[PDB]
Write a protein that binds this DNA or RNA. Sequence first.
DNA 1: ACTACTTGCCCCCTCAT
DNA 2: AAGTAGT
RNA 3: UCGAGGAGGG
Lengths: 212, 1412, 87
Amino acid sequence: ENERNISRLWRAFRTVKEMVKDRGYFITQEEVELPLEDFKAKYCDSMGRPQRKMMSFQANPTEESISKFPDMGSLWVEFCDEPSVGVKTMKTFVIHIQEKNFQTGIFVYQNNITPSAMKLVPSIPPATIETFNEAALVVNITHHELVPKHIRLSSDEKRELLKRYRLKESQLPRIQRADPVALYLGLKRGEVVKIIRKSETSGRYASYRICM
Amino acid sequence: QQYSSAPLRTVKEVQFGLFSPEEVRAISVAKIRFPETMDETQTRAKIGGLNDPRLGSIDRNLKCQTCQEGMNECPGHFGHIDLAKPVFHVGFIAKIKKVCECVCMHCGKLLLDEHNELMRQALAIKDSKKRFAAIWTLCKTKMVCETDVPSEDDPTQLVSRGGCGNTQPTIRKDGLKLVGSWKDEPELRVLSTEEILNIFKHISVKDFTSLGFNEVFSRPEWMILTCLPVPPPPVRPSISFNESQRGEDDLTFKLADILKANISLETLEHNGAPHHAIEEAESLLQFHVATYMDNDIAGQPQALQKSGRPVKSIRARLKGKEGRIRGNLMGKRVDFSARTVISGDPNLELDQVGVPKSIAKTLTYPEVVTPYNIDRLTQLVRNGPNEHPGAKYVIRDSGDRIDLRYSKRAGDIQLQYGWKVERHIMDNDPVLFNRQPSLHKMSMMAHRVKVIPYSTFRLNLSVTSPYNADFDGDEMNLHVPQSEETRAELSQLCAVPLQIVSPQSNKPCMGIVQDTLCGIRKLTLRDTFIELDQVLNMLYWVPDWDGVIPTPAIIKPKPLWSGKQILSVAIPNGIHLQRFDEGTTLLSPKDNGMLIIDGQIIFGVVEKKTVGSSNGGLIHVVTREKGPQVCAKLFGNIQKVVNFWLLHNGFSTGIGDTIADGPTMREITETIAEAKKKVLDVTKEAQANLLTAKHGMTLRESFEDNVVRFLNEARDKAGRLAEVNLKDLNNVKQMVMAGSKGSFINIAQMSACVGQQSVEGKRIAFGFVDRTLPHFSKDDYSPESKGFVENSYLRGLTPQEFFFHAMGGREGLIDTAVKTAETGYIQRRLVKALEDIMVHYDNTTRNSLGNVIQFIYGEDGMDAAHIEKQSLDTIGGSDAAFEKRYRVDLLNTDHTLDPSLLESGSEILGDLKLQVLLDEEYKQLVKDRKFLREVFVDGEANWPLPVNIRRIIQNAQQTFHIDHTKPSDLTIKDIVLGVKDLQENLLVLRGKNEIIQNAQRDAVTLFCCLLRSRLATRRVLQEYRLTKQAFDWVLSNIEAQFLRSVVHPGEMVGVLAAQSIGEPATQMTLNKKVTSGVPRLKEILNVAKNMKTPSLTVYLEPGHAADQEQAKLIRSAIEHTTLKSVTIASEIYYDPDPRSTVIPEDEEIIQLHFQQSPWLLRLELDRAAMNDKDLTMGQVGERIKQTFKNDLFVIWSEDNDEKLIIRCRVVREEDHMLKKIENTMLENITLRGVENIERVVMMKYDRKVPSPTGEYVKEPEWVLETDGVNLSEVMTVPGIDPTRIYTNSFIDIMEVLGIEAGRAALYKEVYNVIASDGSYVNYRHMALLVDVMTTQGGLTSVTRHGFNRSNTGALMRCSFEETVEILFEAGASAELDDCRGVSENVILGQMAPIGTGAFDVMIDEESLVKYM
Amino acid sequence: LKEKAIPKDQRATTPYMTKYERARILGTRALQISMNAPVFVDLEGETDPLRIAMKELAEKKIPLVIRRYLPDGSFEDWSVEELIVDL
DNA sequence: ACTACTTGCCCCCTCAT
DNA sequence: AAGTAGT
RNA sequence: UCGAGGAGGG
Ligand SMILES: *CCc1ccc2ccc(OC)cc2c1
Ligand SMILES: [Mg+2]
Ligand SMILES: [Zn+2]
């Protein structure tokens, strides 16, 4: 009853580790398949109640991610225990970000980030902050039948795409910035995603969309 | 028409803009001061005041006094009118007001600065119109023109900005005036046009360029009219219906109105001007200038002519189907056209058109006089216009044109080289033939003229199907090309034989029809034998006959030929067809199937499946193998032998062909009897409350759903009872077997029973109170009351059956009529939305902006006409039968290549390196089996692909006389490396970089899986028995037909896709029960926000396919319910003792759940309804209690107490608080389930899935269907498969799963709309449409709100809808039109950059001397 | 610009002639032949200018170049003599 | 939440400026 | 009238 | 020679 609610949080913790692994950070497959029991074994208090500030974690880029993107900085993933994120925990996490000096910071909120806290979202450039609702994270949408492989292209990969097809970026298919998968990849504006989907005319077809 | 020395060019760009008054006064050739059109003495002169004061001609005298040219030249010259006061341009009052709200008045300055943040980011919007929308949104509410602003460095000490002080007014539109208010009461002043003019004239150049305007082409100040251009007479011409009478145009009068009001305002200004008296003569001048451009203004009286009818505004001229754009530019009336009734002809070739002589004497082609034709043309001129092979006109180089009807010299014209002769249409002239409506490109096709008598166009009957032409009185159109190169465009692109195999359905679109199809079965019958006397006639009837009488199958007492034998004389050599119909063996005992070898029929009755528009039929094969022209001759030769034989065999159909033959009737009525007895049983059931409803369905709905199935399941039984009783001589059965006309239901309704009539799905409703007709007692649900027709058409309907059947027929006719406007308009929106899409010379599929829609057309780069459905032999069967077929183990004496199959057989046993090759071959075939089962999940193997390899190999087996005995001279290196080498020659793209080369392996992947699956070593050696000869030849043919199958850059894929979808939408005789094709397609194409059947298909977790209880648990887990669904009644009592109770049935359960309010709320719940949803009174009360927390003291009876009661009291003077708490409980609060989910049905879908052995097995699973969508919530439910869930609401799929998944669901839905009506449309058309709708990032509706708001050129967008408003914004924003859109070059009369215009043709001087 | 002309040793389009190229060549030629233009083949009795153009194309004695435009103004020139003519 | 909107193949007679 | 875009 | 309205055809 209270027990069935903690399972959903565990499912979102999973989908977060999958999203971090996919974006290009060093996460193992063991950390992803963190089983059901071992979650409450680590993040539950004496009463068996999930303590969320324990769940936050840093993540570093993989070797080949730094080879493909040298400036892929380190990422920090803070969770909040209070179901309404006050502006006090925001400036705590925010000054945390520039203090430890990160590039990307992901904030998972339980129910509602106030209009006061979300004011400090673009307050630490050149670093970006993404805000994720907990319930939209229980299922990884990318595991769906209809969601094909999305791959973030490098600045040189995209420059080569535009050259080899004689294209201005206006002539490229577009992906919305608020698109679920673009949010999943932390897709920023102008970044081109390469979409590999299976086909029935050919075996496999490669399309590209650009952000906004 | 006359020669001009000016250089002739084509329009490259159209630069839109607005007229400055100065430029009008500049190009003005007259002042235009008097409304008098005429000399005022009516002396047939025109006054120096309005009509021709230097403006052009209305007479036959060298006029256009500026041009000295006279009409047919001097296109018209403009004058001006200086307006006495500025007036609005009616088309910009909306934008003027919008600009008025962005700028300060009395200070021409933008309200919001770069000192504002949201502004400086809206300022950076690269688009012009969208930036103006963001600026107007940010500025419509800043009302104070601020003069200083908090700086970027410190909000304390702020920064100045040279700002207006004054407050900005709140503006509102009243009629054609703009009124505003300021800032204890307000003040309202109307804004004078001159005030707005002076403020616009002071707007900074950066500010209005930020507002989307153009410093040189369209300043904002020019939306206000100061000097008004006067169009010349050719825009508003006169009329001469008598002599001393001339009717002036509506526009000339409306101008005279403007001029009258202007002179009134000018004298009132120049004189003593009473303020009110002149400030309403101005309102009248504004009214006339407004209604002169638009007289269809909203919320205003129309400007009415003397006769009451409104004056046609200029906007009215361009807008609408019959306006300027739609009815004069995108479509025209044309010369050199003809139309008459059509008829059929068994004796015309497929690509001929019969032209009556009277039309051939009228239509005329201009032939240039060359030494090759001067003799023939000179003879045609001698015959003149009265005999058929003659001519009408002769054009000399001078230009003046000789009329052979009248010219005195028509006898002795001696022609000269270079002269044109306009000769009559003669035999074999290519002409364009069309029947309307023209839905797909095959509705217009190029034929060969054959001049004939009798006033009717004559068609070959195999060409009826693409035109949708019958001979019940149709007319068809004929257009005669006039250039030597438009004839070439017809004969080399639009010719009928080229259009046989259509890209819409990758199958033929022409077949053997009607008489010839019915007769080719009777002729093909096994016991159909032809005598010698008749054989020789059938042979001489085939024109391409070789003169070799074939040896008769029967010699014996008398020589007899078979029907198959003689028909085979029409089948050319090199043709191989195999088709097993059903229980077909190679012995074909039922003469079933089809086996043609080298163009000779070996067995099988010939019918629709062989010679129709069938997928693998004879026509699709001959067309691919031998060519368009050989297949076109194949039609004529079959329609000549079969038609001749049928002419002498005869064929009829009588009323005896409907006789049910005695006892079969007796056994039919018995069948209807025991059916009318089953419904009377279920009636006494449902009348005694004994039947039980299935979930989510009324007891009554469940009842009628039963009864209907009982009835028309028995109609079909009597149907098959008569189909089986009908002998094989029954001529109707003969036509159903040949596939020429008729179907099962036809025999059923004509001979056995008609069946239940239906309206709107259900049976005949109670139009009267409780009965269908006054000849019936009330509450009569019997079959013969609700519209079951028990009698056959042979026996005859009763007045009741007759009237019910009439109701059902009217529903179909209404459906047709109500839907034709919809299908026709959907067709147009599709075409106009895809029109500018074609394949360019890099295989990318782009629109007129160069925007990529598809990187490779159809994701494979193939012409849909060069594609056949072949099977992928490497996806099914056991994992073992796979190994038995494909595995070769040179290191194993049981699994090696047998030495009988090839000559190096014994010396390769144990070859380790060769086994290394065959091992990597086998690992590639198993990699392919993996890939194929990932792509095609359900195991389907038959998929349309470019090269029919089965025929390409049967050809080799025949061409090379391959015996299944001798061993092949192939080596495993030959096969393995020959195929590995062949693949890198199957080329689509050709760039020299890893992007394009990867795109190549992508576009070629699936075909190569088929190739390796069919050219595997053991297959080539043990099944095909190929030779290094035949094998090398198969490889060269595969490479050839592959390269032939790629699309040609220039294919107007867009229109093809639109027509390929819209035309099946026409044939949809429509309508879990979900919204059907034509309405659902209207839903999809419009991006319908609130669709009609928002179902949701939820698959459950993998390890729960058969767990029915798990499915029941998820049903209860998601299916919504409220307290109302289980509440019988609620009552309010005065029970003021919280410890006692007045209602004695509540005496118990009161000391059991052992200050408050004395007022009791008492609910009674339904035991049955609680049990449908699993009761648990504790859950209900616990939810109510946790719904109100401390405020509401709640107790309830236990889960099996006889009556189910919940008592409720408030806790620490109105008592209507409880009255509102009641419906708060009944309506608001929920019990369990997801919001917006209503019904939830469990259906057990079939599902193919691979056995552990390998082969696919039916392993059905329980699935929940749904009424209502909440994807984000149902998704996160435990126990379901969150990666197989699907919704027909793709708008939701796009919002939860992304744009890509939305594209996939959008295709899945359009595909379901076509497939639900049995139709097949190839992937790439539906795919291309879905890609257009998704390429901009979201769901772009095929709608004047979606695609027509793109950045395509203004002329293209205005050719759809919202024409004049689009041209107005184009003028204000100074749009530039590339003229890359096809619609632009159509408007401009230029060769469009499509097809034969996708390139230029250059002459090369150096090759011009190499050849001489 | 006129760096719009892709050089010959860098052409990447198809080496085959398209339906529309062939139809526009046979039409253009039959038009010029019909306007008394020099013919580069033995007529051998042919008198229809289209059948003459089909004979010139059969022998690759047509002196015309097809300028294939790419979606940016880039273009490749191809002689009819180069282009393979399956159909 | 209400209002402003646009827009729904080809092919004889009667009437009245 | 349907249906949506905009106030 | 200007248009609008009605009635029909596949
Ligand atoms: C003029 C367009 C057109 C032709 C034929 C049609 C047939 C039936 C329907 O409605 C079901 C639509 C049509 C539209
Ligand atoms: Mg008809
Ligand atoms: Zn002139």
